[PDB]
Amino acid sequence: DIQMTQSPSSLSASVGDRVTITCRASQSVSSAVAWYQQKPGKAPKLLIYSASSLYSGVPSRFSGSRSGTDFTLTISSLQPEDFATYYCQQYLYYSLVTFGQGTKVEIKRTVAAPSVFIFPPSDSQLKSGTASVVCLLNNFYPREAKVQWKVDNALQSGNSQESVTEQDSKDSTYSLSSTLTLSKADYEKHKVYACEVTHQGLSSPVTKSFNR
Amino acid sequence: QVQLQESGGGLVQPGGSLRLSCAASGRTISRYAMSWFRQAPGKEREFVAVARRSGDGAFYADSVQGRFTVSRDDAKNTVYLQMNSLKPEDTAVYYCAIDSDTFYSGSYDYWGQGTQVTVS
Amino acid sequence: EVQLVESGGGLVQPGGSLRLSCAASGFNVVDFSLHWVRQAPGKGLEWVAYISSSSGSTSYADSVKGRFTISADTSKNTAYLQMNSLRAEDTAVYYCARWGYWPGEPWWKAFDYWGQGTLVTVSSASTKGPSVFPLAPSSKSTSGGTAALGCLVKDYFPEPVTVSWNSGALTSGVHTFPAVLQSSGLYSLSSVVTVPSSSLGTQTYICNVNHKPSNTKVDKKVEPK
Amino acid sequence: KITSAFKYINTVISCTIFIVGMVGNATLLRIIYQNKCMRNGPNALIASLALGDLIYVVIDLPINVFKLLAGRWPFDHNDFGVFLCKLFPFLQKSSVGITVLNLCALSVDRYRAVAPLVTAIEIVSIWILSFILAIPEAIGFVMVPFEYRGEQHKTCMLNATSKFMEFYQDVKDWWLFGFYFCMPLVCTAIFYTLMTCEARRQLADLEDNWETLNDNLKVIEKADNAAQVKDALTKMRAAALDAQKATPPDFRHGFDILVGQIDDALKLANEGKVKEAQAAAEQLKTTRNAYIQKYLERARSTLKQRREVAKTVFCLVVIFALCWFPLHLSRILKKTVYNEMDKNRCELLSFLLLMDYIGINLATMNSCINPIALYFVSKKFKNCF
Ligand SMILES: COc1nc(C)cnc1NS(=O)(=O)c1cccnc1-c1ccc(-c2nnco2)cc1
Numbered sequence: 001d002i003q004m005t006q007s008p009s010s011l012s013a014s015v016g017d018r019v020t021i022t023c024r025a026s027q028s029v030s031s032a033v034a035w036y037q038q039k040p041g042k043a044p045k046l047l048i049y050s051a052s053s054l055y056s057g058v059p060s061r062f063s064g065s066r067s068g069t070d071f072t073l074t075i076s077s078l079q080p081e082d083f084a085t086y087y088c089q090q091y092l093y094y095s096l097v098t099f100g101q102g103t104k105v106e107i108k109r110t111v112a113a114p115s116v117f118i119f120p121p122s123d124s125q126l127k128s129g130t131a132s133v134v135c136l137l138n139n140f141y142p143r144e145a146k147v148q149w150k151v152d153n154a155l156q157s158g159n160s161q162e163s164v165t166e167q168d169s170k171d172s173t174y175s176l177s178s179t180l181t182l183s184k185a186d187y188e189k190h191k192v193y194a195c196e197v198t199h200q201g202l203s204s205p206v207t208k209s210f211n212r
Numbered sequence: 213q214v215q216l217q218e219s220g221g222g223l224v225q226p227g228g229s230l231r232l233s234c235a236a237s238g239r240t241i242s243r244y245a246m247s248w249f250r251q252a253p254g255k256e257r258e259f260v261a262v263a264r265r266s267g268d269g270a271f272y273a274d275s276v277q278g279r280f281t282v283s284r285d286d287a288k289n290t291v292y293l294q295m296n297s298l299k300p301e302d303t304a305v306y307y308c309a310i311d312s313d314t315f316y317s318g319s320y321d322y323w324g325q326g327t328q329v330t331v332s
Numbered sequence: 333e334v335q336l337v338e339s340g341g342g343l344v345q346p347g348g349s350l351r352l353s354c355a356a357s358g359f360n361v362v363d364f365s366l367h368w369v370r371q372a373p374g375k376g377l378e379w380v381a382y383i384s385s386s387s388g389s390t391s392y393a394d395s396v397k398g399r400f401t402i403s404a405d406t407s408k409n410t411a412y413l414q415m416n417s418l419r420a421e422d423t424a425v426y427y428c429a430r431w432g433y434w435p436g437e438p439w440w441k442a443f444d445y446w447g448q449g450t451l452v453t454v455s456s457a458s459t460k461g462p463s464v465f466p467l468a469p470s471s472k473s474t475s476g477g478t479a480a481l482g483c484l485v486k487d488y489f490p491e492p493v494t495v496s497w498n499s500g501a502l503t504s505g506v507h508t509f510p511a512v513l514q515s516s517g518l519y520s521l522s523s524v525v526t527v528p529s530s531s532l533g534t535q536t537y538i539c540n541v542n543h544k545p546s547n548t549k550v551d552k553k554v555e556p557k
Numbered sequence: 558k559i560t561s562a563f564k565y566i567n568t569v570i571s572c573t574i575f576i577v578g579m580v581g582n583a584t585l586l587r588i589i590y591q592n593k594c595m596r597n598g599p600n601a602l603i604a605s606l607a608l609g610d611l612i613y614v615v616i617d618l619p620i621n622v623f624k625l626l627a628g629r630w631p632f633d634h635n636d637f638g639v640f641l642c643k644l645f646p647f648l649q650k651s652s653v654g655i656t657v658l659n660l661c662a663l664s665v666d667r668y669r670a671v672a673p674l675v676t677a678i679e680i681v682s683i684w685i686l687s688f689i690l691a692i693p694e695a696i697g698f699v700m701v702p703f704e705y706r707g708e709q710h711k712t713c714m715l716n717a718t719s720k721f722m723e724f725y726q727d728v729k730d731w732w733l734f735g736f737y738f739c740m741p742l743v744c745t746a747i748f749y750t751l752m753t754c755e756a757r758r759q760l761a762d763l764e765d766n767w768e769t770l771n772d773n774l775k776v777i778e779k780a781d782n783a784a785q786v787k788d789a790l791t792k793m794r795a796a797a798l799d800a801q802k803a804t805p806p807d808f809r810h811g812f813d814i815l816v817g818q819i820d821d822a823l824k825l826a827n828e829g830k831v832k833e834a835q836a837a838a839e840q841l842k843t844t845r846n847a848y849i850q851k852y853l854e855r856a857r858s859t860l861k862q863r864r865e866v867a868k869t870v871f872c873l874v875v876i877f878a879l880c881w882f883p884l885h886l887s888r889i890l891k892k893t894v895y896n897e898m899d900k901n902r903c904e905l906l907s908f909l910l911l912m913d914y915i916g917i918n919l920a921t922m923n924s925c926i927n928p929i930a931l932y933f934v935s936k937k938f939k940n941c942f
Contacts, residue, residue, distance in 0.1 A: 002791075012269055027791070030799040034442045043427060043446040044377075050440050087377060091442050093794060093820070094365065094384075094431070095391040095827060099377040110274045111259060117480055119467040134467060136480065136524055138507075142271065144316045161520070163509035175507045177522055198318025200311075201273075203249060203257040205318065389824060434820060435813060 002027045006088050006100035012108035012142070017078050021103050023071040023088040033071050035064060036087040040166075044087065048073065083107065107172045113201045114140035114176075118208040121187070131187040135195035135208070137176040146198040147178045148205075152190040156180070214239045218308060218327035224298050225332070234308040234324050235290040242266070244310050246284060246291040247320065251305040260306075263291055264316065295329075303331045334358040334445050336428050341450035348418050352450060354411035354428040361385045361404055364430045366411045367443070368402075372424040380426075383411060418454050425449045455489070457517045461548035462488035464541060467524075468557045474530060481554045482524040483539030486514070494542040495523040502527070502537065532556070563914070568625050570918060571618045574925050578614035581928035582607040588941055595941060598666065599870065601676050602659050603931065605684075609655035610924050613648050618921075620645065630713055639700045642713030647695040652924065654687030657737055660874045664745040667870050668752040671863055693725050730892065734885055738878075745874050752867065756860065766800040767853060769793075770845070777838050783826055786834050790823045804852070811848030818844065869935040876930060880923040884916025 007022040023033065035048040046055050051066040061077045075082060088100035114137040121131045137145060143164070149156055159182060165175045178195070194209035216236035224230060234246075247262040263270045263282040270282045276295075284291040291308075306327050309320040340352035354366060368380040382391040385404045392400060401414045411428065428447040432438020467482035483495060495508055506525040514520045523539065535556045542549055588595055589604040620641070623631055632638030662679055699718060700711045717723050773789045773796070780786045794816065801812040822837035891909040896902065932938045 028795050028799075030795050031802075032798070036443075043449060044443075045446075046442060046444050049442050053440075055444070089442070091431075092791065092798075093823060094367075094382050096791065097367075097379045099379070102376050108269075108271075110277055111262070111271050113259075117469065117473065119469065119482065122465050122467070124465050128463070132484070132486075134482070134484070134522060136482075138480070138526065142316070144318075146317045161512050161514070163512055163522070165507055165509055175509070175524075177509050177524070179520070179522070200247065200262060200316065200318055201259045202318065203259070203320055387824075391827065434817065 002029065002090060002092065002096055002098055004088055004090055004098055004100045006103050008103050009101070011103065011105045013078055013105060014108045015078050015080070019075045019078065019105060021073045021086060021088075023073070023100060025069050025071075025090060028069060029090045029092045031066060032090050032092045033064075033066070034089045034091065035062075035073050036089060037084050038087065039084040078105075106167060109141055109172050111201045112139055112141050112173065114138065114145060114197055114199050114206075116195070116197050116206055116208055118195055118210060120210055120212065126184065126187065129184055130181060131184060132179055132181040133193055134177060134179045135197075137178075137197060139171070139173040139175065140199060140201070141173055142200065143174055144200065145176060147176070148196045148198070149178070149180050150192075150194045150196070152192050214310070214322055215325075216308065216310075216322070217325045218293075218306060221306075221327055221329035223330065226298065226300075228298055229294070229296040230298070230329060231292055231294050232306065232327060232329065233290055233292045234327070235288065236310070237289060239310065240286075241284065241289050241291065241310070242286040243314060244312075245316065246282070247309050247311065248282070248293060249307050249309070250302075251307065252301075253304070257307070261293065298331055300331055302329070304329075336430070336445060336447040338426065338428055338447045338450040341426075341452050343453045343455045344418055346418065346420065346454060346456060348454075349414070349416045350418070350452065351415075352413045352426065354413075354447065356409050356411075356430070359430075361406055361409055361411070364432055364438075366404065367429045367431060368413060369427045369429055370424045371427070371449075372421075375424075378424075381413065420454050423452055423454050425451055451491075453491070455517070457489060459489050459546045460487065461543050461546050462486060462493070462541065462550065464539070464550045464552045466539075466552060466554040467522075468554050470557055478526055478528040479530065480524050480526045481537060481556070482522055483541070483552060483554065484520075484522050485541055486520045487518050488521075488543060488546075489518055490543060490545045492544065493519075493521060494544075495521070496540045496542075497523075497525060498536075498538065499540065564625055567918070568622055570922070571622045571625070574922060575614060575618045578610060578925045581925065582611040582614070585928055585931070586611075588938070592941055598676065599663060599866065601680065602662060605680055606656060606659055606927065609652050610927070613652040614924055617645060617648060629710065633711060642698045642700070643695045645713070646698055647691055650691040650694045651687050653737055654690060655683065656877065656923075657741055658683045658687065660877060661741050661744055663870045663873070664741075664748040667863075667867050668748045668755075671752045671755050671867075693721070697722050697725060730888065734889075738881055738885060741874070742878055745871065749871065756864070759860070763800075763803070763853070763856065766796050767849075769796040770800075770849075774838075774841065774845075777835065780831070780835070783829065783831060783834075786826045786831060786838075787823070790819055790826065790834075790838075794819050794823070803856070808848065808852045811844060811852075815841065815844050815848070865937075869931065872930060872934050873927060876926065877923065880919055880926070883912065884920055887912035887916055 003026045005024045007024070011019060011021075013019050025033075031051045033048075033051045034046060036044040037047055038044040047058050047062050048064040049055065051071055052064050054060065054062065059079075061075055061079075063074045063076075065072045065074070071088070073086070083105050085102050085104050087102055089097070091097055117136045117138070119134050119136070121133060125131055135147060135149075137147065147162070149160060160178060160180045163177045163179075167174065180193075192209060192211045194207060196205050196207040198205040214236050215238075216234045218232040218234040220230050220232040242265065245262060245264045248260045249257045250260050251257050258275075259273050260276050261270065261272045261280055261282045263284050266284070266286055272278075272280060272282075279297050280293055280295045282291065282293055293306075306329055308324045308327075310322050311317070312319040312321055335357045337355045338352055339355075340350065342350070344350050356366075362385060365382065365384040367382050370378040370380050372378070378393075380393050380396055381400055381402045383389070383402045383404050385406055390402055392402075396415075399415060399417050403412045403414075404410065405412070413426075415422070427449050429443045430445050431443060432441060462485045465484045465486070467484055469479035469481060473479055485493065485495070493511070497506055502525060505527060506523060508523045509521065511519045511521050525537065527537065536553060538551055538553050540549075540551045585607040586604060589600055589607075620631065630638065630642065632641065662683070696719075697715050698713055699716055701714050701716055702709045702711060704710075715722075715726065717726065770793060773793045776789045777786055780789065797812060797816050797819065801809065801816075804812065818837065818841055822834050822841075825837045826834035887909060891913075896905040896909065899905070901908075932942065
């Protein structure tokens with residue numbers, strides 16, 4: 001009941017930039033909205049209440065506004081401390097409390113191209129009984145990328161896990177690791193295992209393969 | 213199946229500017245993004261700029277950052293590259309592509325016919 | 333000096349019982365109402381339950397009704413939450429928040445003070461150490477360019493694991509990914525180093541892993557094939 | 558014929574308009590400065606208009622009658638008598654300024670109420686600006702010679718003496734048009750549109766909140782289960798919290814108690830008992846009928862009063878705009894389409910002068926008519942008569 005929708009989902013902006021987040025409500029909560037800020041591994045803190053009001057201690061750059069059933073939170077100066085997650089809330093009554101999905105602000109830079117590697121299984125894993133191959137994507141921006149595994153030129157849509165790293169501080173890049181695991185028999189039944197990468201920077205998708 | 217070529221180029225002199233656009237029809241740009249490239253002689257196509265859907269942002273490579281600019285208009289289906297401060301190494305055949313996904317993934321299948329912007 | 337602390341977190345089996353606590357300092361429970369808020373790992377926020385001691389009123393969310401009970405103690409100045417019949421979805425981080433009463437500004441102030449949080453894990457399998465394997469790059473893989481090696485660890489059940497390279501000598505140039513749920517419990521992890529240098533003398537590059545809860549220490553060598 | 562009757566009627570209108578203006582302005586001034594109930598915001602500005610009217614109607618019409626029935630300016634035997642032909646145009650162009658800027662202020666302030674020191678500052682600034690802007694017309698007129706009755710006698714007329722006066726006479730007509738009949742006629746209309754829109758919005762919001770409360774009461778009275786009472790009470794709480802903001806810091810206590818009873822009913826409905834929720838919502842009617850109806854009535858009456866004052870505030874400006882236009886309409890024809898070879902020759906050449914005389918007469922009669930309407934249209938003044 002009384003759902004709340006947060007329109008933006010990931011914003012890339014640099015220092016000295018203007019950012020605006022929108023929030024929409026289904027019913028007609030009068031002025032009962034609040035804006036929260038959360039940094040990783042910490043509890044949220046309050047920024048704006050009653051759709052326009054500043055809590056004590058918060059920076060004065062933060063501002064909020066209301067128009068009908070649409071609420072807007074604006075930041076004019078993006079200091080380094082202002083890179084975290086932001087949440088929307090309505091508090092019309094105690095048992096009717098809902099939160100928005102969440103909007104994350106991240107650093108902006110130029111586009112790089114993913115360097116790719118592929119590592120074959122070692123002797124120990126196959127001696128144990130399980131085989132696993134890994135393909136690695138390094139130092140790419142923005143975040144979106146696609147890794148496709150092909151076994152003997154046949155697509156496989158199972159037994160693959162993807163792990164992504166948070167934005168580093170040296171150059172604001174990401175790393176990605178995709179791992180495919182199988183049985184002993186399946187590792188010798190087929191011959192060729194390949195992984196291919198598609199990203200918004202590279203024109204044609206890159207490929208690396210190995211046969212054994 | 214989408215015919216799309218950029219209008220502009222021809223010639224330029226140092227300290228100049230141009231404006232190119234492979235505005236296309238038969239396919240609403242409102243649901244995709246427009247990406248641009250540069251085919252230097254003897255080199256594979258290199259990324260230059262990309263413009264996402266409306267209100268999402270535009271990204272540029274380090275070679276042309278701070279010099280170019282990409283803006284898109286959904287009603288006219290027109291995407292432009294206002295380029296300035298051209299250099300002798302800028303001489304290369306520009307193309308343009310439209311992605312095939314709404315998750316901003318990697319797919320560049322529909323390639324333009326090819327447009328020429330030479331220098332000197 | 334308004335302050336809140338929670339407790340009682342830990343690891344429980346499917347279909348179990350657990351009890352938390354919320355201590356309040358610097359104010360009285362007879363003037364404020366208490367709420368619990370959940371945060372699933374890598375997800376958003378969710379509301380759970382509400383207690384007011386003055387009116388003795390309680391409210392519960394839809395997904396947790398019939399399995400949770402909430403109470404308070406004014407003499408000890410504490411709030412209590414009890415869960416029964418837990419599932420695998422219940423694993424999250426729990427927060428304790430305070431809210432004022434209607435007449436005036438305290439109602440408009442909304443949630444203004446929060447606890448630090450308490451972690452609950454619903455687990456099935458017991459603890460065991462990890463299996464460590466190498467990942468070496470072939471000579472053709474290098475091809476003059478930088479070649480990355482790696483250490484793979486699998487089948488472990490702590491929450492935290494630590495991986496180090498050459499006892500801190502190789503500080504810059506490594507990435508450790510977040511752990512993943514693997515399959516049928518347990519966790520998997522990989523750590524990878526780009527290591528531009530190709531010198532065989534320094535090619536030792538041992539990976540050392542620590543499993544504190546199970547008291548395990550493993551060291552492996554990524555021989556360059 | 559034309560000229561003799563024109564002179565007679567001009568003398569008659571001057572003689573009547575003199576005493577008409579003095580009576581009207583003196584009456585309005587006395588009421589404003591004595592009636593304790595009369596004094597308010599717009600009344601100071603209206604008294605200012607009356608006094609500016611009086612300071613022009615006291616002396617300027619008798620000398621016009623003197624010129625009508627003598628043909629010669631008085632006090633020609635002395636030397637000071639020249640500056641009268643400077644004071645005669647000095648006052649007139651001042652007075653119109655007072656009537657113009659004020660009719661902007663009445664439009665500026667009346668909207669602000671819908672949306673003391675300030676009035677005194679505005680009045681002083683308006684008077685100073687109007688007086689300052691009327692010095693060129695004083696510096697323009699100067700004595701000129703001619704031969705009549707065997708002596709070099711004088712008629713007051715504008716002569717090109719100093720380049721400032723030349724630059725004045727090039728564009729005085731168009732500057733007068735662009736200032737004294739252009740800016741107010743647009744600013745007042747813009748402010749009127751703004752005021753009307755704001756009033757309509759406020760009425761709509763108030764009516765919507767009250768209707769929401771009443772219909773939700775009726776829905777709960779006929780409810781059958783928990784969901785209906787839950788939704789209706791949520792809507793009630795939202796409407797009450799939205800409506801409480803209109804209260805100016807009595808009524809706030811009533812809104813607080815209404816929200817409290819709504820909260821109690823919501824808690825009872827949450828417990829799962831519909832009948833107890835209906836019993837709790839029963840008491841809301843008494844608080845409604847004892848706290849909300851009165852403030853609704855007060856707000857409606859106050860907004861009615863604001864409309865009532867705006868009525869006369871803009872009837873004045875419409876009368877002024879009707880009165881001043883024909884003179885400029887007749888002048889502009891003799892300046893753009895002047896009787897060079899265009900039409901009718903002897904007819905148009907004198908027709909333009911005839912309507913110019915009529916325009917002068919009507920512009921002077923505006924300096925008396927305004928009190929009449931204030932009493933007749935406002936009605937409030939009648940009560941004070
Ligand atoms: C374009 O015209 C005007 N525009 C405006 C804005 C105001 N007044 C205008 N015309 S007006 O002629 O000033 C006038 C208008 C109304 C009543 N009386 C007079 C008048 C009559 C005679 C003399 C005079 N001085 N010496 C000998 O006679 C001076 C003034």
